[PDB]
């Protein structure tokens, strides 16, 4: 709703990096950091279970 020059006046006039410069950019990056850390550290505990060859407990 024609809110581009106010966002430009905010985005030029700060010192913080670009992916942290928005007002509502706290709701987009903290849960992302949490779920990304979980989602990328989690197969590195299943890889020695695969190297040992022990499969899952399914059915």
């Amino acid at each position: 709703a024609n809110k581009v020059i106010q966002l430009q006046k905010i985005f030029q006039s700060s010192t913080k990096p670009l992916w942290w410069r928005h007002p509502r950019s706290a709701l987009y990056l903290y849960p992302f950091y949490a779920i990304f850390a979980v989602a990328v550290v989690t197969p590195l505990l299943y890889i020695p279970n695969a190297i040992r060859g022990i499969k899952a407990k399914k059915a």
Binding site: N2, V4, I5, Q8, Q12, S13
Partner: protein, 121 residues
């Protein structure tokens, strides 16, 4: 404090003057209204008549040696210049580095290059 928005290229005063006014509620935005920064600078220049980022192959009309050099311009203390003869393609391209305190002599063409270093650091 008080800031106007540089109607053409004469009134720019840094990166706080290239903002411009926003569009209205119904009209599509034109590029003169909303574009900011370096793109706005290039647009304002091209609407005035000039174009910034002056790209041009250098003058290889005359040879020029130490009585009157070939004067090149740079906003820094050095500018890499690739000489290619007294015509445009005489000998193969030899790269010289003329700086603020030393002229650059070609050794195959023989021409010399000297700066007027604009600077303002």
């Amino acid at each position: 404090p008080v800031v106007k928005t540089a109607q053409n290229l004469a009134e720019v005063n840094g990166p706080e003057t290239l903002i411009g006014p926003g569009a209205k509620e119904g009209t599509v935005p034109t590029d003169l209204d909303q574009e900011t920064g370096l793109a706005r600078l290039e647009l304002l220049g091209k609407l005035e008549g000039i174009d910034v980022f002056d790209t041009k192959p250098l003058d290889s009309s005359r040879k020029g040696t130490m009585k009157d050099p070939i004067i090149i311009e740079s906003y820094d203390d050095y500018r890499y210049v690739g000489c290619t003869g007294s015509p445009a393609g005489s000998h193969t391209i030899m790269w010289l580095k003329p700086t603020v305190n030393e002229v650059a002599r070609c050794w195959e063409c023989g021409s010399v290059y000297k700066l007027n270093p604009v600077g303002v650091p």
